[PDB]
Amino acid sequence: GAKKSAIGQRIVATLPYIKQEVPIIIVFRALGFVSDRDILEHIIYDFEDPEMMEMVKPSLDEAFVIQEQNVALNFIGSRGAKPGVTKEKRIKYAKEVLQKEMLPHVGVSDFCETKKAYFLGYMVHRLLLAALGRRELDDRDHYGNKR
Amino acid sequence: KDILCRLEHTTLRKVTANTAIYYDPNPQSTVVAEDQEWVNVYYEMPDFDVARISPWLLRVELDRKHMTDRKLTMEQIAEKINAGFGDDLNCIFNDDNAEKLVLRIRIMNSDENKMQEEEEVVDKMDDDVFLRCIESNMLTDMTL
């Protein structure tokens, strides 16, 4: 109407356990990356394509509201429940879910947050190729895609 | 087929081929080389209140292949855009004989109390994000 008028460029994925939908760029602030140069590296290893920029450019505006890494750990745990008014307890819950609950197959250790950040970037870039015009849709009845 | 042009819901997004945001300080002396003599020869337009308008230019491009498929003119587009948002919206275009169909839009500044007259630390609408709302509202809500 008169605010942003660009809601179609949003993503707001549905993370496990989570009540409502939260953006995916907020998770990158909690993984130890507070710069747009590093986050863009996780998505694609070759940012020399101007066509792939118009899709990720509106999504970068949602990251300027949270710059500190400690703040991103509080926004995730605040939407799960409400443990009173203590913001310290909401940080420990976001630490175990990010490692043991979110993507358990890549590793559940503490030093696995560096390896886990690169795995999430490939999942986002693959969905954007089929949502723009460079990739087809995956078939569900494909026996090779099932076990 | 002449009635088909009036009955078919021709969306404005399909008509527009390209849209870019430019920085044009002097409206009479634009920076675009291919569209320089078009905005300069037009002098009958009352250019008295265009010195304190929005410097950010939102130039759109109209597809010519779509004009020959739906049978449309250039005089029926400018008369509809100004009748949708309101009178506080300038519109200008060129003839369909150059190299491409362009259309420049501006604002109608009253030049009276539209410059921190009452201060009010709230900020009505920033000039950088003002063109993004109209660019995404005309390509969907407005229908020819």
């Binding site: 605010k3 500190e68 913001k87 | 709230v122």
Partner: peptide, 24 residues
Amino acid sequence: AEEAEEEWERRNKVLNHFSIMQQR
């Protein structure tokens, strides 16, 4: 101030950063 300014920022998103540092 991360829990008091975030709820009001997402509601309208019509503000500037110059008005936040000046108050602090």
